[model samples]
Target: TVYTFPDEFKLGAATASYQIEGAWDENGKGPNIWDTLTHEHPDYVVDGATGDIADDSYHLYKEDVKILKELGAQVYRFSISWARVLPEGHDNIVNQDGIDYYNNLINELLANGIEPMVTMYHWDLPQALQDLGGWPNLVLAKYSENYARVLFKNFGDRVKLWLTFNEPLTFMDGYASEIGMAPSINTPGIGDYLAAHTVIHAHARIYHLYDQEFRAEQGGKVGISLNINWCEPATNSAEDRASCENYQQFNLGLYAHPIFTEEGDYPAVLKDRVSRNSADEGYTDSRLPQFTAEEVEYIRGTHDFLGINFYTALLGKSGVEGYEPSRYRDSGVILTQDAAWPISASSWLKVVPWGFRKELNWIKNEYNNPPVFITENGFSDYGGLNDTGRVHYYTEHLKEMLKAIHEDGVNVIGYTAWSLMDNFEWLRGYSEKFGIYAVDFEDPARPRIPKESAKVLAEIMNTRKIPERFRD
Candidate 1:
């Protein structure tokens, strides 16, 4: 059978400011957690590296845009650095240099007939905000509101697609709970929950700001990008099934349910489980926190589309032991891996294309078939121009996405590869390369050479056809 994407379906690539646009302290930019973390704790990164001058996209974004035009991408999804734009992550002052830089980048993309999809935050919280208790402090809600307003006023006219946050769970949970990322705060249960609470409110406030203030004039769509890994039951038992469902609900539904669903609150299962765990742990209130009735209504219907960043899947089972008081332990699910699936350079990422289809259907059924954008999906390789494994991974995953759209009748609007070119990969630094174009980090110019997968994706974008080999 011939597999084809919808004519209106967008094909693009994505990148974050901190990951690609280096010059961390350049152009009147203030320090962010990443700048501080990488400088103070160089050993935390795999290669003792920092994004001090990552891909140098700050100077070479014209080259980056040219690459996107050559790749036949219809849209380019990139993020703006909070500190880069606001300098202090507040409304008091504006950075003209930061505004000029992004203006040039956006204008270049538009001149090349590529739509610019912008993300407001991608984990690069200004140190100013972090010092003020980051997302946990109530003051952050106002700061975030003003930040969104500034972005809307400046660039919303040209940017048609806007994402308020990128993977709130990864930053809040990974950083606060797991201590795996920057600003490593190990207050698993309490700290992460507080962050999540603030994020939810901040996102809602921004969404409403865009909807009320900008939508009439700007004619754009606003949403949040959530990174959710699909969870599959380990067996055909009720316990396994429940565990799998709970895992997905805890990971994806905690954020999606409030905005996408009519009820506009946490998932019932999540509320029940976390509250029970909290009571057992001797808390007077639910550790997960509760939203007031007014806030619930305020947050609902805030998104025009659900931006998803899916990479892999996990096998879920019951009776997992908790090493500490955290969300993972509270869920009571143990995640295992299918050793049969092929692995990537990153230990967490595994080849499980079938999970892609399963996740699409889950989102369809759970969220009443809201329009979904695959904002970030790509394979990681150590480093190479001839990345055959990444080529196969993209083909298989794209095939699954096509099936979700055509066969399952899921409303998928767009698909963006994780990155445009290789740069810094967070805690792993430059070790985990997910770019379609391979970048030689050793080179001062940071030249980008297209991988084999880049050609495959370009062909798919231009022709809208999946090769027969990928079909099987």
Candidate 2:
């Protein structure tokens, strides 16, 4: 269906602290998993690429801001690396240099009339924290609360939109399902769920801390960003429908259930199914963690708004034996790709605009309808500005996003393109480009050029309409 947004609607872009900012070890910066993984375990990354020097945005942020300004973004959502700020992941001493760098970036965005939305954590845990158990250890929650306090004390007044974490599920999948990241461990099934539970608790504690300790004074909104890649039932059968629901539970529900659910535990059906399956597999209990009543209360209503980061969609039915109840595919559900879905430059991402509407509606119905923000949504390709594929993806997906806002009654207030410029894509490295502006990594200047998608985005941002398809 053809859909479009109103003039006042927001259009901006997003970037992460480590993904875009290079100088991995500069300015008294401590090593993060990305830094260690790329340097020590080069094989973890498929292209042997590390973010050692991404776009050098740490040094070239002024230029980055200029790119955002040119695109006419009302807000720029970016993350702050804990390691870069604390260097040791402790609160004993704050790094003034790290603080200064963010201050400059925030001030520049504000000066350009761009509101700053700060994500406190975007999966770049300090190696120090990892040594002590990362998110799995409950101690990390306390440390995160302390670290958040530092941010509130320093930049709370200026940064209005705050996000707790980017995507806890990605971290879980990386640790449990995939062995491509730092300290990569696949315990068959358990570690991811346990680690995710602690991370959610950490999110709750930090959100509550901000709401209670600082919000009255600082007066800013805070929320957690759910990186959702929606899935559709493979067929019309009841089992296929059930498989689709379970996919949402494991993917979206992994984090959302803790906060959005009324009882604030894992989704009942999911918990039961997974637990029974694990027991069937000879395990004593489910790999996923169960929440205490106190933990449930802590996590419930922790968010002031909902932030969704969407990319592609997948098709799932049910999984067979030996691969039952894994990360993406539900146990006993056979999962497969729809041959009809068009592929993009990124091998995994398929252009599926309809899924955007479906996922947004799902969030609205599930959460009692909270304010939503499209934090990260973009198309990826293997190469440059002549990216017609990306342009088509945005035009269609964004129009569908407008439908969610206008027709579906979804309270989606902001939409930030996945990136302002191409930089490091974890595991894939610099091989994929999701940026509106292409960054030449080879050049010392790392110059930025407007891609075809950039002009389309610029026009939408400026005029708020989906123009006709470009001529050949």
Candidate 3:
């Protein structure tokens, strides 16, 4: 497909607070789940290390902004640390130091003519709140809404794009599947379903809060960032097609169905599957909760825009008999990594630019063509400057995105690369570097050096067009 984007299309980079910003407990910043998990269960992390001073973005944000300015980014998509803003994750005692840090960062970006897209929660829940049951309990949803309100009232004027949550499914899987992530509970369907329900409610409440109380005056957009991984059906068999659809429903529908479908609830097949699985496990009720009529309405049309993060695509087939329903297999799909594609240092991320277009089209048709933003899409390798694979990854991915916009008419507004600089990758520690710039965590200054991809991206942003391939 011949794909091209409008000349005015936005191009930028993305980062998270905990992953980049260090000074973990400095300046009155309360402990977050990362700190708690690393301190308590050191083995959970890949390197047996903590992000006590990951990339030092907290102190070096100005320099990072300079890098963005140099790269000609129109906006910087980033998240606010729940623990940093409200040390204990409550409004009772706002952390002045934490507020000042973000305030300065936002102002500095605006001063540089860069718009700030603020994500309220990016998986760094304040540990204090987790002690009160984390997101599994519905009350935390109420707390999350209030937290967004606080950010809206304070930074709403400067930050135009507000995202409520980043990939609720990932968090759900982390807890329910007993993955390496924190709040490790393997409640499977029960834990994930409840957590997902509350997260959806929390997202809607925050979006409504901004719309009713702040939008008219502040003039900002609010949405949730959903991570989409492409899933291709295995062959033309009917059963394989069904397996693919089930995979999408479980992965994407678990979050998008309530907001996108005409009559919002769990997808029929998925609901039945969950019920059967729960019964098989000898549970009284279906693990997945049924949304009430009121909730269905509340969640539908809750988003002002769609935030998308695409990585890899999987060719999926139906699982064999005696394959117990673990979280991966419970979706009723079997995924295979294409041997032809270049692999990332991390096993999970495989290079497949075609998946980008497939995912964008899926979102467009699935959600009635909401305005979308490519929130996080990039490659990871283990190097500093000589990273040609990263460059190739971005070029191919961006080309696919352009095709979606110009040919398919998907309303993708912007593209933010996965990261600005190398930092602590949650499970992988500092091994996988998914950044345009390499950050020296060993250096007290946390000095950042531009990688080859960084230079390529800078030029692309400057020209507003992809440079001729192999020009260098």
Candidate 4:
């Protein structure tokens, strides 16, 4: 059975500025949290590698555009470095050279007949803003609004789709907290909660700004990109099913319920559980912050669409006894991997294609059938141009995605591959490669060779049909 995509469905590839554009301190761009974290704490990353000169995309963006054109990508999703445009991350300091760099890249992509999807923030908070206490700081929300306004004014004329933040949960939970990633603020539960609250406010403010000030004339859609790992019940037991719901609400519903639902606020389950846990810890106030009635109204209906970044799935169950009560553990769910599933270079990622279909339907039923853009999806390999595993992963996952669209009637508007080329993979550094184009990191030239998966993606995009070989 051959599956064809809708006529208006967009096919594209994505990249983040911090991951790809590696001019670090050049072009009058101030340092970001990633720059400081990697440089100051080199041992924090797995390979002790930094994104200091990652792929040299700042200088090699033309080569990137050429690759995108070759892949027959209809859209190119990329992010702007916050410090690049505003050197200090404040409206007072505007960097002209930084502006020129993005202008050149946007113009080049447009010249090649590829529409640009601009993400306002992608986890590269400027060091200056970080000094002011980062996302948890209420002051940063105003700074974020300024940053968004600058991008809309400069690039919104040419860019049609805009995402306010990319994977806020990942940055807030993994990076900012003590558990994972860099700039590890040892405070686990409280820090993440505060950061998430500020992020929700910031995203809402910028989304409203774009809707009111820019959308009418710029004619663009504004939304937030969330990273959600699909969770399935480990067993048929009521405990496991309830645990799955708890994990989903805490991870996804924390942010999604506020924007997608008619009534904006955290999920009742999330609020009730966190409050109970705080009482257990002898705190009078709930660790999860409260939103004002006015704030709820402001955040509700802020998104024009939902941008989702899905990678893998996990089997969820109730937590074991005697474990410390952390943000993740506090949800009263323990996530475990199925040893039977095929694993990727990253330990956390497991190939579970059917989960994609289930996840999409869940989103449709939960969020009143909002339009969705698959902002990121791909498989990671160690290093190779012949990545058959990745090819299989793409084919299988995409088949499930098509099933959601055609069979279940999910409102999916587009699909963007995780990356255009292999670059820096955050704390894992360059070790975990997720690009269809395999990049030779050791070579100074940073040559990009298209893998077998690239050919599969190009065929799918151009022909708009699943190949006969992939059908089985």
Per-model TM-score on C-alpha atoms? 0.98, 0.95, 0.96, 0.98
Q: Cα lDDT of model 2 overall?
A: 0.83
> Better model by lDDT, 2 or 4?
4
Question: What lDDT does each candidate get?
Answer: 0.90, 0.83, 0.83, 0.88
TM-score of 2: 0.95
- Candidate 2 clash total? 5
Task: State which candidate has the highest lDDT.
Answer: 1
Candidate 4, 361: how far from true, in Å? 0.7
lDDT of 3 by residue, 300-320 (tens): 888778888899988878773
Q: Clash pairs of candidate 2? A: 318-333, 318-334, 319-333, 319-334, 325-331
After superposition, candidate 4 runs with Cα above 4 Å error: 174-179, 320-325
Candidates 3 and 4 compared by lDDT, better number: 4
How do these models rank on TM-score, best leading?
1, 4, 3, 2
Could you say which candidate leads in TM-score?
Answer: 1
Please give the RMSD of candidate 4 to the true structure: 1.4
Candidates 3 and 4: which is better by TM-score? 4
* Candidate 4 lDDT score relative to the true structure: 0.88
Regions more than 4 Å wrong, model 1: 174-179
lDDT of 1 by residue, 18-95 (tens): 999898989899899999888988877888889999999999999999899989999999999999889998878899
